[PDB]
Design a protein around this nucleic acid. Structure first.
Lengths: 142, 134
RNA sequence: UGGUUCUAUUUUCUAGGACUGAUUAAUAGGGACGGUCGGGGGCAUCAGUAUUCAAUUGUCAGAGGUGAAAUUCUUGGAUUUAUUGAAGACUAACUACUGCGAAAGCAUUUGCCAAGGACGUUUUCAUUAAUCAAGAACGCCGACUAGGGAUCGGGUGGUGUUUUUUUAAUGACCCACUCGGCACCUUACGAGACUGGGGGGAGUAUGGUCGCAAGGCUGAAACUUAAAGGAAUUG
């Protein structure tokens, strides 16, 4: 999975910090995934100072809880479960709820998921991801 | 340079809520010193938990004089001891990894500061002359 | 720790003797502690996508590059596309009249190693201090008054919103105060007394000295001399 470049260029603004993290996690299958994360420091409503920077220990703590809870969302998922988890953007809601104790953090995203190794084939698992099928087909008519 | 020190009150009395004894404070002082704390640690523990404000006010005299008159004198003053052990910690760091030029510079600074007050303490003769920092 | 002997009910309590004796605590200085702070340093680790190279496909005639071209590569498949590997760097945007460092300088993650600063302090020492020739390491001014807005680090108080709950502690913002920084915008008031050098700027003249420079068709001079060329050319 990957963002387009225009999305994160449309997200990056000066006078904030981008906290980005990544973890290399092996799922409940033997797929190992490098999964990324980006998050940008919001300013609160009634904030009058123009900066809203994080104090870099808040960055280390935010990046710590990002790594912990998204490596908890993997290992507790298969590939199909993780894919159905990151279609409706809900790991981002988990990061936002787990991190609003530290900094506000607008538009957290996952932004990038890379396969590194894949276990075996398991045609049965693939056909259970899709649906069944077997053919006896036509016969020659002589 | 910053101005961050402690502001000693104008009073020189016990604060009139200090109902403890002027001798039980000394017994607590020598107990903490014999279990092994530096006099600054005695003063901060006595201030934080058994609320003597400062013991030059509440006891008779200051607590290094209390320790020396109760037999718990230091081998070397606390300033020199802490600067000595900081210098030897930086020296062991430097023997471990030898590309830390900044820590070499801080060792030159710490060694200069060692020599300054070692010279002061030597001309006062708190510690004996022919003392070298090894 | 050792030793001697004095009082009344089998063991109770007792008295004596030998191995310290001036101040503060500098809006001076140092040291400890505490929660921290930073792109300060060292080691290790982790990642990123470019680039270069290689392997494998796909397709076919050009690709670079330039103001145009060219050297170069290319039907033994270049360039483009897709998958993957290897290498050496580098740390994009975030990135600032922001931060840290004694300066040169320092920007990916995580950990270790020591360090440092500011703040907080009813902790400690007690003049331990300031400046620099020598030497060592690394490589509109000042002795001067007040302010103002913004920002970075710490602290105190307020009492609203984001937070939230019986797992630990821990935020973010708003406001006032305060300490310390990088700057900026102003104010008031002061004698502030890798070494070697001719003499202003812009010009003008030159019967001096030192130079460089003209002539005149070449050939071609001792030779009025060939070929060929030049020049001008409505034979």
């Amino acid at each position: 999975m990957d963002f387009t470049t225009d999305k994160l260029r449309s997200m990056v603004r000066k006078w904030q910090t981008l906290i980005e993290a990544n973890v290399t996690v092996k799922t409940s299958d033997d797929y190992v995934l490098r999964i990324f994360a980006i998050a940008f420091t919001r300013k609160q409503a009634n904030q009058v100072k123009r900066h809203s920077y994080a104090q870099s220990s808040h960055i280390r703590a935010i990046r710590k809880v990002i790594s912990e809870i998204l490596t908890k969302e993997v290992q507790g998922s298969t590939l199909a479960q993780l894919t159905s988890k990151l279609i409706p953007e809900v790991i981002n809601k988990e990061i936002e709820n787990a991190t609003k104790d530290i900094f506000p953090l607008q538009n957290i995203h996952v932004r990038k998921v890379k396969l590194l190794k894949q276990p075996k084939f398991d045609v049965g698992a693939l056909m259970a991801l899709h649906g069944e099928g077997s053919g006896e087909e036509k016969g020659k008519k002589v | 340079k910053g101005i961050s020190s402690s502001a000693i009150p104008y009073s020189r009395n016990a604060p009139a809520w200090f109902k403890l004894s002027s001798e039980s404070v000394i017994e607590q002082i020598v107990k903490y010193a014999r279990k092994g704390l530096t006099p600054s640690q005695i003063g901060v523990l006595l201030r934080d938990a058994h609320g003597v404000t400062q013991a030059r006010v509440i006891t008779g005299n200051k607590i290094m004089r209390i320790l020396k008159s109760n037999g718990l004198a230091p081998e070397i003053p606390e300033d020199l001891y802490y600067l000595i052990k900081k210098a030897v910690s930086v020296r062991k760091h430097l023997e471990r990894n030898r590309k830390d030029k900044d820590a070499k510079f801080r060792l030159i600074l710490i060694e200069s500061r060692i020599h300054r007050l070692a010279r002061y303490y030597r001309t006062v003769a708190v510690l004996p002359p022919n003392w070298k920092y090894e």
